[PDB]
Amino acid sequence: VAVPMDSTGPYRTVSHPENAPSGVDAGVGPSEWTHAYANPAHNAAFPVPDDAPEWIRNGVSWLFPEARAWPLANPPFGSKTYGAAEASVTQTQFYGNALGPSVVDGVVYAESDDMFAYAVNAKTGKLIWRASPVGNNLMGNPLVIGNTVYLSAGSVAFNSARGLNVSFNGIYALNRSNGKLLWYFATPGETMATPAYDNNTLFIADGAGNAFGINATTGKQVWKTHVGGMDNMSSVTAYRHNIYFAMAIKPYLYCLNESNGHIVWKGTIPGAIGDVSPAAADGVVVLDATTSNVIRAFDAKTGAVLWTRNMGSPAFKGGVPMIHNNIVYVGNPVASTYQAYELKTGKLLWTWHVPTKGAGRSAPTYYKGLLYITTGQYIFVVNPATGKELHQHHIGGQFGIESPVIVGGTVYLTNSWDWIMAIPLKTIS
Amino acid sequence: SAVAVPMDSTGPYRTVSHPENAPSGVDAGVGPSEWTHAYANPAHNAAFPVPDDAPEWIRNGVSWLFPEARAWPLANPPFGSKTYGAAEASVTQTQFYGNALGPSVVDGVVYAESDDMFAYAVNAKTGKLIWRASPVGNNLMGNPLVIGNTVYLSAGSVAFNFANVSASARGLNVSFNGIYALNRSNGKLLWYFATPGETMATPAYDNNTLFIADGAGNAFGINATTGKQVWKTHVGGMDNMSSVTAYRHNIYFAMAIKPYLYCLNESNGHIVWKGTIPGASNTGIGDVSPAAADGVVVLDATTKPQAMFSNVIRAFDAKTGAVLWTRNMGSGGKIPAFKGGVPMIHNNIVYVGNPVASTYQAYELKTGKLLWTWHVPTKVAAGAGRSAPTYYKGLLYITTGQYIFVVNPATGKELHQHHIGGQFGIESPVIVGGTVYLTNSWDWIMAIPLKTISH
């Protein structure tokens, strides 16, 4: 497919096939990545088989600079002129990674607001390919289905529709092996949200109020439902053949049928939302938004409110929820806390106050019985039964919306300072 | 020791330097030795004779084509035409992938900067790459300034922060903005000066100082050597595309939302005077870069009843702001996207486009006497009349739409047209000796022999 490009220039697709994993190394981690944070529960935790190679289990340590890499010990670029907080947010949104990586078949995939997508060997950290089919920010995490990697393009800014005529938006489909551009589907508004893959279909909502089903093979539109409002960061969740996503300015959480895009139901959070990606498990969809910070649970099929809780009293307004064993683990960015709630009943099990040294935006990861949380410059280990901090490890840079991706004994991460990295799980504990 | 910015020194944004491609000797004495303004000088006339004994290649003309990083074939319609519409996609591609202004030609080198986020130095004879660099992850919408051994860039995005969606600031917290100073020979970053708002406008250089106004309502004087602030003045409003003009100890630029042409002192940045165009577009006066020659500053803008719907040109006393003359440039159905023509001044005559009516006109600089009107052929459907003409050896050259035109400046009649393709931004032909240098919104730099476009 032809896009504006100098094929010999700095945006060209580069591929290093000798860095691609082979054999057992190409079977490490999941074989697909269908969601922001890998699945509807937003839990990026991946145990490995007994026969897994030793490197993934023992852990590997590497650091890969993306195109705009800034040293992790440095403060935010632009602090003097912008202020440190605003500088950090800007650097996240225009320079580095807003979400974490996707780890599939021995390869780490990431996309960056530096406008490149990357595929890097999960063992060695060496570049397998990089591509920049569109001159816009890539604010999600790559979807990886079979032999295709799916990116979505959009800007945080406005030229009401966000991203409309601010560069070019929509879904870009690349060849998973070499990064070559298979097809694109342009959208009127920005898609910073990550799409969802289900049943050979991609689902996305844009900042122009549009929801799309798109055939994941041909790239052609299946259906278009104009709900209104704008999806900013709320990544689509596909659960039991329906999709769920939130829109701002017209503040609704939507449930739509995958086959035709029919609106099954809508729900609200009092005190208007398009930032937070909903999570779904065991017939419940969970969403929270900053109003303080209010979390609400809905029946997946009907949208009936199961419970609502005020979490206590911020550029990204909400925490991304994660669900594990019928327990919601979610951050409150206003109080810099994390809380655990029973999924069905709304019963608060515990609260953890992040050490005083942007906290509470990211979904925890529940791996082998412990919680792992990347916020600020740190990765923390918290006991999920007590809510008490066990370990902490200083990394640097900033994690805005990033969640730890944990495979075997290895943690994979991106960073707002535009880095991809692998850290051993035992280094952290 | 380059200044540190977010960068992978081995990655795709790295500064690439090919010194072997640099011109030397007589080849590096071709063109002016400085470029201090958008369209090279306060008059916006980027036209450069060479001596009769200058190198043969520049006199006879050279022909080459250099793809920039997002290059799109000149025959293609705009990218994203089906989803955005043709015109909207053309403007979007100009603003995020291509060159909005022309190149700067200094000492045998063609410099350009692109909304693709790269700046480029290319050999004027051969079109071969000398350096490319991307010190900032934002669009570069002006033309590079070149003084001594330094090249100066300004960075800004057209877009708006949602926190900003008179109190609004364009480009504020939309990536990173301001002035970036690069070593002329290899592109290495000497310093940068960040600004709160976008600076899409090209700065001006005068007296070891760089002058810029941003989309947050701030004007800045900045030491051209150290990069330190000499002064800051918050004027209010937004400078969108109004490139600063530095003339006789003062600077001049126009601001939108708070619609004024400003004159500020070069040394301390205090406001000398403010001026208006009657009923001038509130959004669009801040699009147009003022021109200045022989004690006169000239600005035009699309105007509204408040005054009628028209395009109106005003000349001001450079020192006091007193209005010397005002002329109505004609109406037209289209309310244009770019809300005026960039004026050029040559031989006491203002040559300026009217994008509402798709015309060009000439006016006596001191009096405002209208000499003639030229209607751009209707096959140029979008963008006709926003770009400043270039006056060279008795002829006018105009790049608009897909075309370059040769117009007789005495009669205003078209003499020749030559099809290029792609789309021209707000671009004036840069003419040196017998060669024409151009950029294109499709992200190309090119050289064409003057005699080629004349036949």
Short mmCIF file of C-alpha atoms in Angstrom, two decimals, chain B residues 277-285 288 300-304 308-313 330 334-341 354-356:
data_model
loop_
_atom_site.label_atom_id
_atom_site.label_comp_id
_atom_site.label_asym_id
_atom_site.label_seq_id
_atom_site.Cartn_x
_atom_site.Cartn_y
_atom_site.Cartn_z
CA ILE B 277 -7.00 46.31 9.17
CA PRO B 278 -10.63 47.51 9.23
CA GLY B 279 -12.94 44.57 9.75
CA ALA B 280 -9.96 42.24 9.39
CA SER B 281 -10.69 38.57 9.98
CA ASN B 282 -10.25 37.77 13.66
CA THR B 283 -8.80 34.33 12.88
CA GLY B 284 -6.79 35.23 9.84
CA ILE B 285 -4.83 38.44 10.33
CA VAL B 288 -0.01 36.89 7.12
CA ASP B 300 -3.26 42.51 3.99
CA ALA B 301 -5.96 40.24 5.30
CA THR B 302 -9.39 38.97 4.48
CA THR B 303 -11.96 41.32 6.01
CA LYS B 304 -15.55 41.15 7.26
CA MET B 308 -17.15 44.76 4.04
CA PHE B 309 -16.37 41.19 3.00
CA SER B 310 -13.22 41.58 0.94
CA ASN B 311 -9.46 41.33 1.06
CA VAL B 312 -7.97 44.59 2.30
CA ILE B 313 -4.36 45.75 2.12
CA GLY B 330 -11.78 42.52 -4.34
CA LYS B 334 -14.62 31.49 -1.39
CA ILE B 335 -13.80 32.39 2.17
CA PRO B 336 -10.18 31.18 1.95
CA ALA B 337 -8.37 29.01 4.46
CA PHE B 338 -5.22 31.16 4.40
CA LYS B 339 -6.64 34.59 5.11
CA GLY B 340 -4.41 36.78 2.97
CA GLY B 341 -1.64 36.96 0.42
CA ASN B 354 -5.99 37.88 -3.03
CA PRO B 355 -6.99 34.33 -2.04
CA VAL B 356 -10.68 35.23 -1.75
#
